[PDB]
Design a protein around this ligand. Sequence first.
Ligand code: W36
Lengths: 237, 300
Amino acid sequence: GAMNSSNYAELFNNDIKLFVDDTNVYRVTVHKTFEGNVATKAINGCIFTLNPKTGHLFLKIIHTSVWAGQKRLSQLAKWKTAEEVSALVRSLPKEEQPKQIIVTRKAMLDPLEVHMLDFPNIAIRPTELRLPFSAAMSIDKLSDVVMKATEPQMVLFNIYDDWLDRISSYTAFSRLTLLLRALKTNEESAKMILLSDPTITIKSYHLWPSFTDEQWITIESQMRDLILTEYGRKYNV
Amino acid sequence: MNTVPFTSAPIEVTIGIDQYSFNVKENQPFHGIKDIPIGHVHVIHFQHADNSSMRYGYWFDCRMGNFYIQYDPKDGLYKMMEERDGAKFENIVHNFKERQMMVSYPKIDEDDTWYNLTEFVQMDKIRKIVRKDENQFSYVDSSMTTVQENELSDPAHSLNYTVINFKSREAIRPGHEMEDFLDKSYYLNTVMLQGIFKNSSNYFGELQFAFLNAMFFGNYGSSLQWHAMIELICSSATVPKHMLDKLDEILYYQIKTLPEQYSDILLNERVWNICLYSSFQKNSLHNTEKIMENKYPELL
Ligand SMILES: Cc1ccc(NS(=O)(=O)CCN)cc1F
């Protein structure tokens, strides 16, 4: 059923799985009208579909045209997400389709389950983990491609860059969730940490900086300090 | 006026006849039920004094033969049987009617409760849900599982209700996933009514038979079928106006007749709150909602 800290290691076994996060599918900018009412304007969004083992991210860009003339957008967003994940599974070769898809929000279960009726042998699971995938739009290259898109588009990334050459997927996922949690709790400080030292660059084909192993330790320590900090700043401790 | 005579009453039993019941003592001189209204299906049912486990009973229509009850001491229940010799049957029934060994089906003249609870139920459809073709009457008990339940184990002893599943390909047209899941009109009107049931009368009949198996036998899978058929209508934006009016009347008498003390197990909180307050037809069941609120406000 639900994925939590007891079966956390299942994420890195050899059964193909995908996380699906829908937080950034429907995104708006609430503003005042001339009559002094309030109105939203939509902006491009994305579905965050991630293989936690390999790091393959299928970033489906949601172009604002997909909302035109539509009612109840927040509900539509869930079905839109489900349709696009389903279209994605169907595009994949059989030996590449997931055996499980884990949704990060329980409201996605039914939409996805319905769109996946053709795939009875693929389990749709929730999770109790409070994963920080909403902060994916705090990654500059991802945010950039989303905002520039002029039509629906799928863009493939590895969110681990080359890290699996040196570390395990368990450790790569941990680093990733720590980076994202930091970006979610204090984007400014987090970005300062990552980019403070001009000599550490982001390769054209990567999302994060080229940190030596020792530098990743320093960085990881700085992100944990920031998360404890903001937790204190928040709760006063 | 027809009669289900009884050979004897060797074991103490609460006997139910449609919505009535009466206690018979062990070896009491009891020989059946007379004055049973012609024109409806009926159900005679049993709950043994010693072992209240297994309520069980028979669905029958007196126009379809002469039926009686004899206790079988090997299988340990009151069995319905069909006496074929109609002259022996008049003689047997007349003997017991003369000795006043029978109770009278106690219909009050103003009382349309059974007609309203069985309006669309027909024996021929009962017999296709309960498959036992060498008998004209149909046996049901507390424990019999439904075809759908056995999917999720003896096929011969199943209730073959129409399978309804809101997350199935039958229910969800390819390319209409959101539309059909949030508005089941397609499933109701095309798949179920036009496709499977043929008309709303067959659909209401099955729904009413499910409720009665739930109330009289505590058959859990029937209660599932009853609620599922209610939810499918309530969850349909587009329902013929006559079907809606009738549903309101159908449900009203089901809720009216339900024992107050069994509401905790026979009513599904989620289905009722959704049907009365959230669904498309939230405004289309005035009588059902008035009675539910006055009688079972706790559930809501
Ligand atoms: C109602 C009633 C009708 C028929 C029969 N039996 S028979 O003629 O003896 C046939 C017994 N198998 C018994 C009854 F009690």
